[PDB]
């Protein structure tokens, strides 16, 4: 071990002196091969992001004002430790931004001009930074100043620290804007009291300011919030229902080479000896040269963030797009009004070319994205670099965790009616060679397993989920001897039969041969004992149809299915012999784009699905035919859902248990993010 000194910056000689005081008490328990702190003192937050990023430093707590700064260019900063503010079994690191109302009131989100306001104060992140930034776009112009147009905007406010000369309207309700306590209407709770009094119609302000300010859900059952859908939801589906998300106390630090897991090593052991109650000696969330230095005094603990999450994900899409609407100080041109370009997200080079040429069929309406994951794929969607893309129903649960919806599904029985007939699923099901005839469900212990990527459902979730419950631990790289579960961490032994060059080996993309359906089954012809893949991939490789050098002269009939009972079947007999049922994969999006979506693909699919006779020489967007590019190669349609609409209602009650039963062995880092900005 060599350097294990976290450079901390302080912003203040209050600060400073805490931070020193810090370094002293650790130095006192810790022993010398564990963390230690040093001080650096700087004038200001932003003088912090910038040693930080110019390797003088190492770490700094920042608001999620701050937090976004610190992400742009040139200091690309990302957070690593959260301060949590409930109990230890429910920490609160986000707070939520909402817009409450009295029940009753007659109006929604789009018909907030002309209304009272009430504000807990000017350049405020929930009172102010937040809702007009969201309503940026609908403020008259001129935009700036800002003051002014909010002015306009709504028929009388309470904003506390605004200028009541050069903006009355803003104080209409609040005389003289007092920037303190002694106005009735400052701050969290008095801009509640502001809604809760009848002097405003709408308080922005924090889902916990409602909760503190009244005893009992009969009281709550009093207000309403506003939703970005222009509906209405109850105070306590705030989580479904706010402006934003936002996490309250962020550590960052450099995306590269920042030092992030010595920085949670060192706050992990601090929130243990000094923490909230722990010593008299010395407090982390408290001091006597006063509040808030370094980390906020209502803080309880740290809370360590999940690696995959960058600052865009952290904050979220719905807090980032606000901010820059406020920063950047620029309206996109209305109406216009138009859906036009969907982005597509297009896996890696394979699909990307695949994507090109429907963009250019397309007109104008399709656009394409790459990235080399699906989960890299999913994160582009989230943060709006991406708008859909379709997926296994595995990775439309992860999609679904991180607030995505399916908008339509894909469809592989022909019928006269695909659009409007929604289908019970395919099936999953276990491949082997007739020759090898040992083989049974009953112990695959020792053997060699193919898999289209972990995380995936016929390849994955069904059979692991099964084995787990069988052996009851994850380590299924120490069940099979080896195998190809594309996705797996480098150095297991599921990444040993994968067929990939350099960097590309176990890739969970089509640059890693064994990856998917077709890649499976040619893993199990060549290295593997076992496949797990959907029942149509026999057939759809064997007999000349797959004209490859290594499918060329496969045979169906030289390979069978294991069936649960610990028999096996010929390939046919998928309906006696499979592991079980299976979503089809489907499409999925931002809950915003969601009609755009679903009015594009339709109008895409008329022109270039199953109704295109010749499909050489013309586009065909259903067609690989070996590599699934896009959609499935069997898909006949994409199908309605009507009210399928999100990922437990679309996947179903049987599928979701499933791979909750999993939650244990995920390796999903996406997951692991997701689930922390949402539990
Ligand atoms: C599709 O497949 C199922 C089961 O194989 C079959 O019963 C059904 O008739 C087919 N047609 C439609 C429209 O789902
Ligand atoms: O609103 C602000 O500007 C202050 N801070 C936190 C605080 O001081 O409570 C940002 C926030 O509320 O996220
Ligand atoms: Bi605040
Ligand atoms: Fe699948």
Same mark, same amino acid.
């Given at each position: 071990?060599?350097?294990?000194?976290?450079?901390?910056?302080?912003? #203040?000689?209050?600060?400073?002196?805490?931070?020193?005081?810090?370094?002293?008490?650790?130095?006192?328990?810790?022993?010398?091969?564990?963390?230690?702190?040093?001080?650096?003192?700087?004038?200001?937050?932003?003088?912090?992001?910038?040693?930080?990023?110019?390797?003088?430093?190492?770490?700094?707590?920042?608001?999620?004002?701050?937090?976004?700064?610190?992400?742009?260019?040139?200091?690309?900063?990302? !957070?690593?430790?959260?301060?949590?503010?409930?109990?230890?079994?429910? !920490?609160?690191?986000?707070?939520?931004?909402?817009?409450?109302?009295?029940?009753?009131?007659?109006?929604?989100?789009?018909?907030?001009?002309?209304?009272?306001?009430?504000?807990?104060?000017?350049?405020?992140?929930?009172? *102010?930074?937040?809702?007009?930034?969201?309503?940026?776009?609908?403020?008259?112009?001129?935009?700036?100043?800002?003051?002014?147009?909010?002015?306009?905007?709504?028929?009388?406010?309470?904003?506390?620290?605004?200028?009541?000369?050069?903006?009355?309207?803003?104080?209409?309700?609040?005389?003289?804007?007092?920037?303190?306590?002694?106005?009735?209407?400052?701050?969290?709770?008095?801009?509640?009291?502001?809604?809760?009094?009848?002097?405003?119609?709408?308080?922005?302000?924090?889902?916990?300011?409602?909760?503190?300010?009244?005893?009992?859900?009969?009281?709550?059952?009093?207000?309403?919030?506003?939703?970005?859908?222009?509906?209405?939801?109850?105070?306590?589906?705030? &989580?479904?229902?706010?402006?934003?998300?936002?996490?309250?106390?962020?550590?960052?630090?450099?995306?590269?080479?920042? &030092?992030?897991?010595?920085? *949670?090593?060192?706050?992990?052991?601090?929130?243990?000896?000094?923490?909230?109650?722990?010593? =008299?000696?010395?407090?982390?969330?408290?001091?006597?040269?006063?509040?808030?230095?370094?980390?906020?005094?209502?803080?309880?603990?740290?809370?360590?963030?999940?690696?995959?999450?960058?600052?865009?994900?952290?904050? $979220?899409?719905?807090?980032?797009?606000?901010?820059?609407?406020?920063?950047?100080?620029?309206?996109?041109?209305? !109406?216009?009004? /138009?859906?036009?370009?969907?982005? *597509?997200?297009?896996?890696?080079?394979?699909?990307?070319?695949?994507?090109?040429? *429907? @963009?250019?069929?397309?007109?104008?309406?399709?656009? +394409?994205?790459?990235?080399?994951?699906?989960?890299?794929?999913?994160?582009?969607?989230?943060?709006?670099?991406?708008?859909?893309?379709?997926?296994?129903?595995?990775?439309?649960?992860?999609?679904?965790?991180?607030?995505?919806?399916?908008?339509?599904?894909?469809?592989?029985?022909?019928?006269?009616?695909?659009?409007?007939?929604? /289908?019970? $699923?395919?099936?999953?099901?276990?491949?082997?060679?007739?020759?090898?005839?040992?083989?049974?469900?009953?112990?695959?212990?020792?053997?060699?397993?193919?898999?289209?990527?972990?995380?995936?459902?016929?390849?994955?979730?069904?059979?692991?989920?099964?084995?787990?419950?069988?052996?009851?631990?994850?380590?299924?790289?120490?069940?099979?001897?080896?195998?190809?579960?594309?996705?797996?961490? =480098?150095?297991?032994?599921?990444? &040993?039969?994968?067929?990939?060059?350099?960097?590309?080996? +176990?890739?969970?993309?089509?640059?890693?041969?064994?990856?998917?359906?077709?890649?499976?089954?040619?893993?199990?012809?060549?290295?593997?004992?076992?496949?797990?893949?959907?029942?149509?991939?026999? !057939?759809?490789?064997? %007999?000349?149809?797959?004209?490859?050098?290594?499918?060329?002269?496969?045979?169906?009939?030289?390979?069978?299915?294991?069936?649960?009972?610990?028999?096996?079947?010929?390939?046919?007999?998928?309906?006696?012999?499979?592991?079980?049922?299976?979503?089809?994969?489907?499409?999925?999006?931002? =809950?915003?784009?969601?009609?755009?979506?679903?009015?594009?693909?339709?109008?895409?699919?008329?022109?270039?699905?199953?109704?295109?006779?010749?499909?050489?020489?013309?586009?065909?967007?259903?067609? #690989? /035919?070996?590599?699934?590019?896009?959609?499935?190669?069997?898909?006949?349609?994409?199908?309605?859902?009507?009210?399928?609409?999100?990922?437990?209602?679309?996947?179903? /009650?049987?599928?979701?248990?499933?791979? %909750?039963?999993?939650?244990?062995? @995920?390796?999903?880092?996406?997951?692991?993010?997701?689930?922390?900005?949402?539990?």
């Amino acid at each position: 071990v060599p350097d294990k000194t976290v450079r901390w910056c302080a912003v #203040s000689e209050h600060e400073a002196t805490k931070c020193q005081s810090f370094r002293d008490h650790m130095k006192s328990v810790i022993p010398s091969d564990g963390p230690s702190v040093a001080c650096v003192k700087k004038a200001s937050y932003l003088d912090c992001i910038r040693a930080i990023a110019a390797n003088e430093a190492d770490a700094v707590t920042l608001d999620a004002g701050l937090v976004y700064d610190a992400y742009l260019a040139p200091n690309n900063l990302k !957070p690593v430790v959260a301060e949590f503010y409930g109990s230890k079994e429910d !920490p609160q690191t986000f707070y939520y931004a909402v817009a409450v109302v009295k029940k009753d009131s007659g109006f929604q989100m789009n018909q907030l001009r002309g209304k009272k306001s009430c504000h807990t104060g000017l350049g405020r992140s929930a009172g *102010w930074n937040i809702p007009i930034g969201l309503l940026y776009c609908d403020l008259p112009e001129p935009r700036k100043p800002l003051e002014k147009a909010v002015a306009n905007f709504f028929s009388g406010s309470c904003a506390p620290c605004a200028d009541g000369t050069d903006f009355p309207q803003l104080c209409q309700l609040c005389p003289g804007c007092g920037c303190s306590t002694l106005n009735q209407y400052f701050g969290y709770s008095g801009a509640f009291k502001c809604l809760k009094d009848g002097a405003g119609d709408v308080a922005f302000v924090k889902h916990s300011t409602i909760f503190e300010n009244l005893a009992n859900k009969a009281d709550r059952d009093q207000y309403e919030l506003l939703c970005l859908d222009n509906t209405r939801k109850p105070v306590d589906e705030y &989580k479904d229902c706010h402006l934003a998300q936002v996490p309250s106390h962020t550590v960052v630090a450099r995306s590269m080479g920042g &030092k992030e897991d010595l920085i *949670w090593e060192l706050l992990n052991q601090a929130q243990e000896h000094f923490g909230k109650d722990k010593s =008299k000696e010395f407090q982390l969330f408290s001091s006597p040269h006063g509040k808030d230095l370094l980390f906020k005094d209502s803080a309880h603990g740290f809370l360590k963030v999940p690696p995959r999450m960058d600052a865009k994900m952290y904050l $979220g899409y719905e807090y980032v797009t606000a901010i820059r609407n406020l920063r950047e100080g620029t309206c996109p041109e209305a !109406p216009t009004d /138009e859906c036009k370009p969907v982005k *597509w997200c297009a896996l890696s080079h394979h699909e990307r070319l695949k994507c090109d040429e *429907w @963009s250019v069929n397309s007109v104008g309406k399709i656009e +394409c994205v790459s990235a080399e994951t699906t989960e890299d794929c999913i994160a582009k969607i989230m943060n709006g670099e991406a708008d859909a893309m379709s997926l296994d129903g595995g990775f439309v649960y992860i999609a679904g965790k991180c607030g995505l919806v399916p908008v339509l599904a894909e469809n592989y029985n022909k019928s006269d009616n695909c659009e409007d007939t929604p /289908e019970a $699923g395919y099936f999953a099901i276990a491949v082997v060679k007739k020759s090898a005839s040992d083989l049974t469900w009953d112990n695959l212990k020792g053997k060699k397993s193919c898999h289209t990527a972990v995380g995936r459902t016929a390849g994955w979730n069904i059979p692991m989920g099964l084995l787990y419950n069988k052996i009851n631990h994850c380590r299924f790289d120490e069940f099979f001897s080896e195998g190809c579960a594309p996705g797996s961490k =480098k150095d297991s032994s599921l990444c &040993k039969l994968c067929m990939g060059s350099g960097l590309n080996l +176990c890739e969970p993309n089509n640059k890693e041969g064994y990856y998917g359906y077709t890649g499976a089954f040619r893993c199990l012809v060549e290295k593997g004992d076992v496949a797990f893949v959907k029942h149509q991939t026999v !057939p759809q490789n064997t %007999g000349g149809k797959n004209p490859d050098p290594w499918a060329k002269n496969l045979n169906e009939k030289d390979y069978e299915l294991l069936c649960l009972d610990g028999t096996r079947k010929p390939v046919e007999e998928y309906a006696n012999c499979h592991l079980a049922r299976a979503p089809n994969h489907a499409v999925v999006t931002r =809950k915003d784009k969601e009609a755009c979506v679903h009015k594009i693909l339709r109008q895409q699919q008329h022109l270039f699905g199953s109704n295109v006779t010749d499909c050489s020489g013309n586009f065909c967007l259903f067609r #690989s /035919e070996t590599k699934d590019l896009l959609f499935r190669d069997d898909t006949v349609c994409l199908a309605k859902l009507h009210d399928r609409n999100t990922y437990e209602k679309y996947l179903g /009650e049987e599928y979701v248990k499933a791979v %909750g039963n999993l939650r244990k062995c @995920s390796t999903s880092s996406l997951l692991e993010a997701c689930t922390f900005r949402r539990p």
